[PDB]
From a paper:
In yeast and other fungi, N-GlcNAc2Man8 is modified upon entry to the cis-Golgi by the CAZy GT-32 transmembrane α-1,6-mannosyltransferase (MT) Och1 (Outer chain elongation 1). Och1 acts as the first fungi-specific step by which N-GlcNAc2Man8 is dedicated to higher-mannose modification. Och1 transfers a single α-1,6-linked mannose onto an internally (α1−2)Man(α1−3) linked residue on the D1-mannosyl branch (between the Man(C) and innermost Man(4) residues) and from there, the glycan is either marked for the outer cell wall or organelle retention (remaining as a “core-type” glycan). Och1, a family 32 glycosyltransferase, is a predicted retaining GT (ret-GT); identifiable by a hydrophobic (or aliphatic) residue at the catalytic DxD motif x-position.
The crystal structure of Δ52-ScOch1 was solved, in the apo state, at a resolution of 2.0 Å, R/Rfree: 0.1978/0.2428. Co-crystallization in the presence of GDP-Man nucleotide donor substrate did not yield electron density indicative of ligand binding. The N-terminal and transmembrane helix domains, accounting for the first 51 residues of the primary sequence, were excluded from the construct used. The Och1 crystal data reveals electron density covering the C-terminal GT-core domain of the type II transmembrane protein, with the exception of some flexible loop regions and the C-terminal tail, which could not be resolved due to poor electron density (missing A-chain residues: K72 – Q76, H315 – E327, N374 – T400, F465 – K480). The three-dimensional structure of Och1 confirms the GT-A folding structural elements as predicted by its sequence, adopting the canonical GT-A single Rossmann-like folding pattern. Och1 exhibits the archetypical β-sheet core, flanked by several α-helices, with an additional pair of smaller anti-parallel β-strands housing the glycosyltransferase catalytic DxD motif, at position D187-M188-D189. For positions N203 and N281, the electron density was such that partial glycosylation could be resolved. Sequence conservation, as seen by colour mapping onto the structure, is largely localized to the Och1 active site (i.e., the nucleotide-sugar donor substrate and acceptor binding pocket).
Residue numbers in the entry: 51 to 72, 77 to 129, 132 to 314, 328 to 373, 401 to 464
């Protein structure tokens, strides 16, 4: 295999399908084995994982209440993958792309794996992944990613926002009636007062709850980046990693620039490896990449606001997605096929950055 980077793909159209007549690059291999279907709906399926099943005697008692909100009947299929099942399930799932599972198995320690697992599960099967310390507040068929009524309200009240490379005859709001392919919630507002490293990025999305269609290119790019970083950062890669990476950008693979074993991996390593900072980097890289190469990218922001002129200028003059587009979000926004939810949606009751209570109509999941 060759292991491309995600941070120097400005020369590649990330939405573009690569076809073959009658392979080697891990980006193309993931696309081939897990194709993206923007026309199909999000699967009505919930994924959770823990060391043990829910009826296990060691299942933590403080989680048993939370897990019932997800596992019910929901007019939605629920799957809890116990630790004994994770490896054979990923082996069955990523059989077409075995280097992905090799890397997962080589990850030192339990937190890197549990972080990485959510992206693997969603990319291969879609649905919702939510951590065990989360509570579902409103049924998922009532979410704005799912409820045809809500999606129609977004379509009927908001016109596409143009950008430098856009062609208006291609931009229509009703494309989103096929549902977003990725649904994420703000964790930290980019305009907040706190600039400690409590959160790892300026624009930060909750990693504890994510919804997606299988094959979404952002999940592809996350898996690429984490796969290549793992192999170049562990003591037993099983492959001659130095011969398989981009020769122009060697410092972008080994995690210490940002070998690791079970004893030397710290919290800021996890942060730079599988955590919410790499998630947000990949997401913004993707947003800016698709505007560069496509004339039909749908941009909907019902909150347009104080940053309007800068937003308009970033889009229409610089062809770039400004961080201000995601500031003071009170209603969902659309970037291509990514729906970004307000802080209240997956982070209610934090009494900060405008988060409302889990009683708000925008509150969908409470993080415990
Ligand atoms: C997709 O979205 C659409 C649009 O939002 C959804 O359709 C609407 O669904 C709402 C549900 O919130 C519905 O409003 C209810 O209609 C009921 C039947 O007509 C009413 O009986 C009900 O009244 C109660 O709730 C109100 C809250 O606004 C209270 O003000 C009112 O006093 C009533 O409260 C009593 O009952 C509740 C429990 O029901 C209790 O907590 C109270 O204490 C009190 O006893 C609502 O008004 C709309 O009618 C729907 N709109 C349309 C056009 O159909 C749709 O359901 C979503 N789809 C999915 C799958 O979720
Ligand atoms: C996997 O994803 C990670 C996360 O995105 C990715 O690491 C990132 O790589 C890029 C590109 O190498 C880094 O981007 C910046 O590039 C400029 C240009 O030289 C630097 O100046 C930046 O750092 C300094 O300057 C900034 C001010 O201008 C400061 O904010 C900064 O702290 C430095 O002083 C920076 O290098 C980006 O920093 C990293 N991100 C992280 C978290 O390290 C990685 O390349 C991907 N790997 C693969 C294999 O795809």
């Amino acid at each position: 295999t060759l292991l491309p980077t995600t941070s120097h793909s400005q020369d590649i159209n990330l939405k573009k399908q690569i076809t073959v007549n009658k392979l080697h690059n891990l980006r193309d291999q993931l696309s081939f084995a897990f194709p993206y279907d923007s026309q199909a709906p999000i699967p009505q399926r919930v994924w959770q994982t823990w060391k043990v099943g829910a009826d296990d005697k060691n299942f933590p008692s403080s989680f048993r209440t939370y897990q019932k909100t997800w596992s019910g009947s929901y007019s939605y299929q629920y799957s809890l993958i116990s630790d004994d099942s994770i490896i054979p399930f990923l082996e069955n799932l990523y059989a077409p792309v075995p280097i992905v599972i090799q890397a997962f198995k080589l990850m030192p320690g339990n937190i890197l794996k549990a972080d990485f697992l959510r992206y693997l599960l969603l990319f291969a099967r879609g649905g919702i992944y939510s951590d065990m310390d989360t509570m579902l507040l409103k049924p998922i068929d009532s979410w704005p990613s799912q409820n045809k009524s809500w999606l129609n309200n977004i379509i009927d009240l908001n016109k596409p926002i143009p950008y430098k490379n856009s062609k208006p005859s291609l931009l229509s709001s009703d494309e989103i009636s096929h549902q977003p392919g990725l649904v994420i919630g703000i964790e930290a507002d980019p305009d907040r007062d706190d600039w400690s490293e409590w959160y790892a990025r300026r624009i930060q999305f909750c990693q504890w709850t994510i919804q997606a269609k299988p094959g979404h290119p952002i999940l592809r790019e996350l898996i690429l980046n984490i796969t290549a970083t793992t192999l170049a950062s562990v003591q037993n890669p099983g492959v001659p990693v130095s011969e398989m990476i981009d020769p122009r950008f060697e410092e972008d693979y080994n995690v210490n620039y940002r070998l690791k074993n079970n004893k030397n991996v710290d919290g800021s390593d996890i942060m730079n490896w599988t955590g919410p900072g790499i998630f947000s980097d990949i997401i913004f890289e993707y947003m800016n990449n698709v505007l560069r190469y496509n004339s039909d990218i749908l941009l909907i922001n019902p909150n347009l606001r104080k940053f309007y002129k800068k937003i308009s200028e970033s889009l229409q003059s610089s062809n770039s997605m400004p961080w201000e587009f995601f500031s003071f979000l009170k209603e969902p926004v659309i970037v291509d096929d990514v729906m970004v939810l307000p802080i209240t949606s997956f982070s209610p009751d934090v009494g900060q950055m405008g988060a409302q209570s889990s009683d708000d109509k925008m509150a969908f999941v409470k993080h415990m």
